[PDB]
Amino acid sequence: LGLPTEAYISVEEVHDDGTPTSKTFEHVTSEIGAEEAEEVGVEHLLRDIKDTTVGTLSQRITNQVHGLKGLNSKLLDIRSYLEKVATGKLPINHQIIYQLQDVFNLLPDVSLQEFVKAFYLKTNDQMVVV
């Protein structure tokens, strides 16, 4: 859906259920980078899209990608949330289901009240720049 590959580190987390220690690999966040010569090769190899361009198309295309890929991410991920409850039981559900889903229910999060104050305060923030 995005940055390719994945990273899993070997660790023993046991469990909160006190089961005999088993290994479920924890996800490690992966990022793409380079140093000097590895930058030279690919930066010439692009020959595709404008660079960057800073300030105009860059931020708004990222608003499409990060937004829309964030829509279908949680969509298909919430599709797996219900599908795993529908099919695939057990566990499945438990464990983290009740706590993770309540973390989703942590913040609805709307006004009243102070969130109304943040509104016209944000309006007062756009004052200066405009």
Partner 1 sequence: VPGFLQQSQNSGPGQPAVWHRLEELYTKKLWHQLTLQVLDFVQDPCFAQGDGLIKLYENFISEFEHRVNPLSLVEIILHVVRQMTDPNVALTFLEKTREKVKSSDEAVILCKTAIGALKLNIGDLQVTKETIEDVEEMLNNLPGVTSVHSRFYDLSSKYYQTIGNHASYYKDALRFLGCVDIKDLPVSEQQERAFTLGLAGLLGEGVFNFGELLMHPVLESLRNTDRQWLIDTLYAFNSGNVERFQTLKTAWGQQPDLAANEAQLLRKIQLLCLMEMTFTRPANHRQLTFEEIAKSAKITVNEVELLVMKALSVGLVKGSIDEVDKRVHMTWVQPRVLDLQQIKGMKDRLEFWCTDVKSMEMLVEHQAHDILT
Partner 2 sequence: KLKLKYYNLMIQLDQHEGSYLSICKHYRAIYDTPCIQAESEKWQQALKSVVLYVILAPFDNEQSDLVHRISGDKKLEEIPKYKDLLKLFTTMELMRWSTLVEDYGMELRKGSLESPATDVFGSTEEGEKRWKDLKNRVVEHNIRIMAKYYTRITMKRMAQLLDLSVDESEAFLSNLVVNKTIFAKVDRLAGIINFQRPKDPNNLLNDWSQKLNSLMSLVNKTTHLIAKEEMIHNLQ
> Per CB under 8 A, which region of 32-40, 43-51, 55-63, 100-108 contacts partner 2?
100-108
Residue choice 24, 52, 59, 111 for contact with partner 2 (CB under 8 A)? 24
- 124 lies in the binding site for partner 2 (CB under 8 A): yes
Residue 19 or 53: the one with the smaller Cβ distance to partner 2 is 19
Nearest approach in angstroms of CB 12 to partner 1 is 8
Residue-wise DSSP of 9-48: E------TT-PSP---PEE--------SHHHHHHHHH--S
- Please choose, from the candidates 83, 66, 68, 77, the residue with its C-alpha nearest in 3D space to the C-alpha of residue 100: 77
